[PDB]
C-alpha cells in the first residue's frame, strides 16, 4: 500500500467502461501479453538491452527459448515494439500475434490458451479505437523486484458482484500442509478455481523446498483459462506445471501420476450431480471402499473421498467444508463411519462466520493423514476474527501461529477445544463437532448483596412515589 495502493486505485480507474467481464477479458489479455513480452525481453537482453529489436533470423538460436520458455514472442511482435505503432490501422494483427507463441509443439505444449479476446465490436473503427484505448491505458500502468499479479488478484476478486478464498485463509491452509517434509510432491487440487490457494507454499519456498510443479483440475472453461494465466504470471517454471480441464467426479485424472503427497482444495457446496448414479461409479477405485455414494443434496464428500484416494503413505491432506454436513442422514453417517474407520480423519478445526464474501456462514477445515498415533482430536475454533467491513480481519498472524502451536503437540486447552477419544466418537453418532467447547459465562451472584440493593431500590422508590403523590396537586 506504500507505493501500491495508488496503483490498485489506478486499476480501479481502468475498470471502465462497460460490464466488467467483457472488457475484463481484454484487460487480462493485455497485461498477460505485456508481462510475457517483458519477461521474454528480460531473458533475451539481460546485459545488450534494446527497446526496439531486429530481424536477426537465427532460428537455431530461436528454438532454445522455444525449449526453455517454450515460446518465442517474435522478432518484432513484442509489446514494446507494438507500443510504438499504437492507434495504427489496423488492430486485428493481434490475432495473428496469438499465432506466434501458439506454435509451441516442442515440447509439452501448454498452449491452445489465448482465445479470450474475440471481436464485439460493431464496426472495425470501433474495434481499432477501443482496443487501442485499452492498450494505451494498460501501457500507462507504472509497475515495471517485479511484483505484478496482485493487481490481477484484485481484478479477479472484483467479480461475482467466483468465491475463491480470503487469501490469509489460504495461507492458513498452506500452513496446514506444513511441515518439514522436503518430499515430492506438491500440490494436487480438485476444483481449484483460481491458483490463489495453489500459490503460497512454493512462492514462499522458491528454493527452500524443491519438489515439482503443480497439478490440478477445474470445472469451468473461462475459470480454467484465468487459472492458467494466474499460475503463469507468478514466474513459475515450465517444467510440468499445469492444470487439466474436466470434473473429478466424471474424469478423475491423473491416477497414474501419482499418489500425491499434499493436497488442498476449495470444493463448492451443494453441487448436485447425476444420480444415483446411473453408471457403475459405486464400483470405481474410490467409492467402493466407502460403501455408498454421495447423492444430490449431499454432494460434498465425493470430493473428500477423491482427495483421500490420491494420497501418499505419509503426507497429510487438508480440505475445507461447512459444518452443516454434520450427520445428514444415514448415508452420510456411514460415509462418516468409513472416515472414522481409522485415523484417516485426524483433526478438524472450525472457523467463525463469515470470514468470506457474503456467504455468510461459518466453515471448518478437515486435516487428514495416514500418519497415526492414534486418537481423534477435534480442535475446533470459534471467535475471534473480525469479518465484514473491509475484508475482514485479516487475520491475526499470532492467532494462526498459536493455533499451529496447538496443532503441533496435542494440548488440552479449555476455553478452546481439546482432544477426545475414539470411545468418545463412538459414544457420539460421529458428530462434527459439538465437543468440546465449555465456556458459557453463567456467572454467580450473592443473595444478600442483591437483596439489600433491592431494598435500597425500594427505599428510593416509595419516597419518590410519595413525592409524585405530592406532585398530583393539580
Amino acid at each position: 500500500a506504500e507505493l501500491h495502493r495508488q496503483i490498485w486505485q489506478i486499476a480501479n480507474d481502468v475498470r471502465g467502461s462497460v460490464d466488467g467481464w467483457d472488457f475484463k477479458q481484454y484487460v487480462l489479455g493485455a497485461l498477460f501479453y505485456r508481462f510475457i513480452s517483458e519477461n521474454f525481453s528480460s531473458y533475451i537482453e539481460a546485459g545488450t538491452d534494446d527497446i526496439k529489436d531486429d530481424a536477426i533470423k537465427t532460428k537455431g538460436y530461436f528454438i532454445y527459448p522455444s525449449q526453455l520458455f517454450c515460446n518465442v514472442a517474435a522478432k518484432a511482435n513484442t509489446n514494446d515494439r507494438l507500443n510504438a505503432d499504437l492507434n495504427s490501422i489496423f488492430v486485428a494483427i493481434e490475432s495473428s500475434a496469438y499465432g506466434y507463441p501458439s506454435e509451441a509443439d516442442i515440447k509439452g505444449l501448454f498452449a491452445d490458451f489465448d482465445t479470450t479476446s474475440n471481436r464485439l465490436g460493431n464496426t472495425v473503427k470501433d474495434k481499432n479505437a477501443r482496443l487501442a484505448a485499452v492498450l494505451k491505458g494498460v501501457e500507462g500502468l507504472k509497475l515495471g523486484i517485479d511484483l505484478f499479479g496482485d493487481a490481477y488478484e484484485f481484478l479477479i476478486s472484483n467479480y461475482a458482484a467466483e468465491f475463491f478464498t480470503p487469501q490469509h485463509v489460504s495461507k492458513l491452509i498452506a500452513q496446514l500442509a506444513m511441515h518439514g517434509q522436503t518430499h515430492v510432491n506438491k500440490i494436487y487440487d480438485p476444483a481449484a478455481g483460481s491458483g490463489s490457494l495453489l500459490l503460497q507454499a512454493k512462492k514462499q519456498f522458491d528454493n527452500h523446498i524443491i519438489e515439482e510443479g503443480f497439478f490440478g483440475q477445474e470445472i469451468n472453461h473461462t475459470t480454467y483459462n484465468l487459472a492458467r494465466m494466474n499460475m503463469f504470471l507468478h514466474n513459475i517454471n515450465y517444467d510440468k506445471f499445469d492444470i487439466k480441464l474436466g470434473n473429478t467426479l466424471t474424469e478423475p485424472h491423473f491416477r497414474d501420476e501419482k499418489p500425491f503427497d499434499a493436497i488442498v482444495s476449495n470444493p463448492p457446496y451443494s453441487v448436485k450431480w447425476i444420480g444415483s448414479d446411473d453408471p457403475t461409479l459405486i464400483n470405481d477405485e474410490r467409492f467402493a471402499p466407502a460403501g455408498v455414494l454421495a447423492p444430490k443434496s449431499k454432494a460434498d464428500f465425493a470430493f473428500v473421498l477423491h482427495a483421500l484416494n490420491y494420497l501418499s503413505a505419509k503426507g497429510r491432506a487438508a480440505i475445507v467444508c461447512f459444518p452443516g454436513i454434520f450427520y445428514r442422514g444415514g448415508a452420510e453417517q456411514k460415509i462418516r463411519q468409513y472416515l472414522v474407520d481409522n485415523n484417516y480423519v485426524e483433526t478438524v478445526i472450525s472457523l467463525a462466520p463469515n470470514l468470506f464474501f457474503g456467504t455468510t456462514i461459518a466453515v471448518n477445515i478437515l486435516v487428514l493423514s495416514k500418519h497415526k498415533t492414534d486418537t481423534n482430536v477435534q480442535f475446533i475454533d470459534a471467535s475471534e476474527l473480525f469479518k465484514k467491513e473491509t475484508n475482514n480481519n485479516i487475520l491475526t498472524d499470532a492467532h494462526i501461529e498459536q493455533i499451529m502451536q496447538v496443532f503441533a503437540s496435542k494440548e488440552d486447552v479449555a476455553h478452546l477445544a481439546k482432544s477426545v477419544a475414539f470411545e468418545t466418537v463412538v459414544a457420539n453418532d460421529y458428530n462434527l463437532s459439538v465437543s468440546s467447547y465449555v465456556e458459557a459465562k453463567d456467572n454467580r451472584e450473592i443473595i444478600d448483596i442483591a437483596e439489600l440493593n433491592a431494598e435500597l431500590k425500594t427505599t428510593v422508590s416509595k419516597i419518590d412515589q410519595l413525592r409524585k403523590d405530592i406532585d398530583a396537586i393539580v
Partner: protein, 346 residues
C-alpha cells in the same frame, strides 16, 4: 462405461428399473439399450403388455451361462413377435459340448462369420502353448495317467489323489522350477508371476500350510533360501452345473457358506496377508469382494509370487505379465481353452 466411443453413446440402464426400462422404451433416441438377461426376464415375467411386442427389435447376446439360457429364450419366443437375435461367444455348443441342450446353430442359425484362434496366433495377437504333463512320480503314475472319468470323478479323495507325499513332491517340483520358469535365474532379472489351480478346496487348505511349512524348512536348510510370497482366494462353490462339458462352475459371493474349517482358514490367511501387507479388508459381505479386486490388482504388478486358485481368475481376468500356469485338475473342450487364455497374451 467402456462404450464411450460415441459421446454421448446413450448407454442407458434401469438398474434394476423395469419401470425405468419401459420408460426408456417410451423415451426416444436412446437408440442403444444395454440390459441383462435377468433384467429382461424380470421385465417379461413382470410385464406382458409392452408396445415393443409388435416392433422391429434387434438382439445381440454375449457370455451365455446356463441359468436362463433356454428359459429366457422361451420367454423371448413367447412374449415377442419380431426379433433378430444374434450371438457373440467363444463357446460353440453343437458337436460334443453340452449334449443335452439346444445348440448354437439351433439357437441362432448360420455361422455367419468366424475368427478362429489360429490365424490370430499367426498375427501375433496371442502366444503359443507348451502343454506338458509331469510324469515324475512312479507311485501315483497309474493314477495320474488314469483316464477313467467315472473313478476320477467319484474316487477322487484326499489320499489316493491328494497324498501328503504326492502334494509334497508337487511342491518340491514347483519350488525347484519356479525361478527357472519365471526367468528369475539372475538377481537383477525381471521375473513373472505364476498360478496354480486345482479342483477341490481341501486340496488348497492342504496346499497353503504345505507351501508355508516347506518354505520354512527350505529357509532353515542353509539360511540362504529366498522364500516366495504365496497367496490364495476362493469363496463358494461349484454351486450348480452352470455350464456345458466342460468349464468352471462360477463361485458365488456367499462368504461363510462353507465351514469355518474353510472359511476361518481363509480368514486367518487374510489376517496373515494383512499382517504382511498392512491392509484392512475383512471377510464380510463388503471387504471380501473388494479384497478380491485388490488382490487382483496387486497380483498384476508382479508383487505376488504365486497365486493358488480354486475357481476364480480363469475367465475374465487378464495378466500381461504371467507366463506359466500349473494345473492339478482334469479339464475338457474349451473351459480348458479359457484356462489357457490366462497366459498367452503378448
Amino acid at each position: 462405461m467402456k462404450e464411450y466411443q460415441r459421446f454421448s453413446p446413450d448407454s442407458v440402464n434401469g438398474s434394476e428399473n423395469t419401470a425405468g426400462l419401459k420408460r426408456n422404451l417410451d423415451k426416444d433416441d436412446n437408440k442403444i439399450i444395454v440390459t441383462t438377461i435377468q433384467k429382461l426376464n424380470n421385465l417379461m415375467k413382470a410385464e406382458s403388455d409392452l408396445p415393443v411386442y409388435n416392433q422391429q427389435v434387434v438382439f445381440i447376446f454375449d457370455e451365455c451361462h446356463r441359468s436362463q439360457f433356454g428359459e429366457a429364450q422361451k420367454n423371448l419366443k413367447k412374449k415377442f413377435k419380431r426379433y433378430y437375435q444374434f450371438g457373440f461367444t467363444g463357446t460353440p455348443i453343437f458337436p460334443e459340448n453340452a449334449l443335452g441342450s439346444e445348440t448354437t446353430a439351433s439357437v441362432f442359425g448360420r455361422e455367419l462369420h468366424s475368427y478362429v484362434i489360429t490365424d490370430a496366433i499367426r498375427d501375433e495377437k496371442v502366444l503359443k502353448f507348451k502343454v506338458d504333463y509331469n510324469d515324475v512320480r512312479p507311485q501315483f503314475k497309474s493314477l495320474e495317467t488314469e483316464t477313467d472319468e467315472k473313478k476320477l470323478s467319484a474316487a477322487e479323495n484326499q489320499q489316493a489323489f491328494l497324498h501328503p507325499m504326492r502334494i509334497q513332491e508337487i511342491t518340491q517340483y514347483i519350488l525347484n522350477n519356479f525361478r527357472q520358469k519365471t526367468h528369475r535365474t539372475f538377481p537383477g532379472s525381471k521375473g513373472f508371476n505364476a498360478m496354480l489351480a486345482v479342483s477341490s478346496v481341501d486340496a488348497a487348505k492342504a496346499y497353503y500350510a504345505t507351501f508355508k511349512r516347506l518354505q520354512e524348512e527350505a529357509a532353515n536348510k542353509s539360511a540362504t533360501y529366498k522364500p516366495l510370497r504365496i497367496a490364495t482366494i476362493f469363496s463358494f462353490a461349484a454351486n450348480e452345473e452352470q455350464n456345458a462339458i466342460g468349464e468352471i462352475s462360477d463361485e458365488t459371493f456367499d462368504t461363510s457358506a462353507m465351514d469355518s474349517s474353510a472359511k476361518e482358514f481363509l480368514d486367518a490367511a487374510i489376517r496373515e496377508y494383512n499382517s504382511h501387507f498392512k491392509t484392512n479388508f475383512s471377510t464380510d459381505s463388503n471387504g471380501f469382494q473388494n479384497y478380491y479386486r485388490d488382490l487382483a490388482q496387486r497380483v498384476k504388478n508382479q508383487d505376488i509370487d504365486l497365486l493358488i486358485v480354486v475357481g476364480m481368475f480363469l475367465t475374465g481376468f487378464d495378466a500381461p505379465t504371467l507366463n506359466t500356469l500349473f494345473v492339478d485338475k482334469n479339464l475338457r473342450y474349451h473351459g480348458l481353452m479359457q484356462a489357457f487364455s490366462r497366459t498367452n497374451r503378448i
